[PDB]
Amino acid sequence: SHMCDAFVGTWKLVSSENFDDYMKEVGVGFATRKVAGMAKPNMIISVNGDVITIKSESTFKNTEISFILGQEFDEVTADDRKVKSTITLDGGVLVHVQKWDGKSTTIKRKREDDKLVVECVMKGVTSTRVYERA
Ligand SMILES: CC1(C)[C@H](C(=O)Nc2ccccc2-c2ccccc2)[C@@H]1C(=O)O
Ligand SMILES: [Cl-]
Numbered sequence: 121s122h123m124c125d126a127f128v129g130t131w132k133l134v135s136s137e138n139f140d141d142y143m144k145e146v147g148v149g150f151a152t153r154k155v156a157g158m159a160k161p162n163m164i165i166s167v168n169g170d171v172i173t174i175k176s177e178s179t180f181k182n183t184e185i186s187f188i189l190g191q192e193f194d195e196v197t198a199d200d201r202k203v204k205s206t207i208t209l210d211g212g213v214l215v216h217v218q219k220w221d222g223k224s225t226t227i228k229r230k231r232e233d234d235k236l237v238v239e240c241v242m243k244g245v246t247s248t249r250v251y252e253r254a
């Protein structure tokens with residue numbers, strides 16, 4: 121009974137494009153990029169009232185965030201950046217902005233056919249991560 125209902129469920133990574141370079145731009149070192157780049161994370165999205173929870177389990181790291189749309193929160197990312205995060209819903213698309221050390225990256229999640237498509241942008245580096253229902 122929510123707009124994020126399209127996103128609710130368990131999703132598994134099925135394809136990746138340009139992710140190594142996105143990780144490099146975000147400050148991930150060589151060894152961490154090599155290991156992290158092998159991973160096939162899941163994405164588990166749930167809603168309880170106004171609280172949205174996004175969990176990611178993988179060999180690299182398990183993470184979990186809970187948030188209210190529009191409200192900034194602290195996040196420690198899978199690659200150990202300590203960031204200030206705001207997530208909003210803009211015309212059906214979940215838009216996640218992460219700010220740290222004067223830098224910023226945007227991760228958008230959208231439903232496209234049976235897929236959940238994730239676009240990751242840092243400066244002029246864009247990566248696409250495609251998920252399907254688990
Ligand atoms: C882009 C999305 C939404 C998550 C995320 O925050 N990923 C990362 C972002 C920066 C650095 C590393 C990762 C990462 C790499 C491997 C495994 C887990 C996280 C999902 C993903 O599909 O990777
Ligand atoms: Cl590193």
Ligand SMILES: [Cl-]
Pocket residue numbers: 180181182
């Ligand atoms: Cl872990």
